[PDB]
């Protein structure tokens, strides 16, 4: 029951739709979206 | 300096893309899986 946060934007699990965990890091759906725009190379 | 994806451990030379945030990195392969997760539920 610990508060977990996205390692990229700092938002908590209670502020995002989804939080994905790596070994010792986390990323939320919003940041995954930003990464998509970058990898897609368009806005 | 050699950088590694914080999520899968692969070096930048093993992936196509590597994006970084504050003391954290993620590659295209992990981003791809994250999309599957988000589009899954």
């Amino acid at each position: 029951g610990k508060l977990l946060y996205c390692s990229f934007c700092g938002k908590s699990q209670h502020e995002v739709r989804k939080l994905i965990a790596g070994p010792s890091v986390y990323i939320c759906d919003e940041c995954v979206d930003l990464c998509n725009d970058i990898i897609r190379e368009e806005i | 300096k050699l950088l590694y994806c914080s999520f899968c451990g692969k070096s930048q030379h093993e992936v196509r893309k590597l994006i970084a945030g504050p003391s954290v990195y993620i590659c295209d392969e992990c981003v791809d899986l994250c999309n599957d997760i988000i589009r899954e539920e």
């Binding site: 970058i38 | 893309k17 994006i19 970084a20």
Partner: peptide, 6 residues
């Protein structure tokens, strides 16, 4: 903020 490493 995000940055492109590669």
């Amino acid at each position: 903020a995000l940055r492109v490493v590669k």
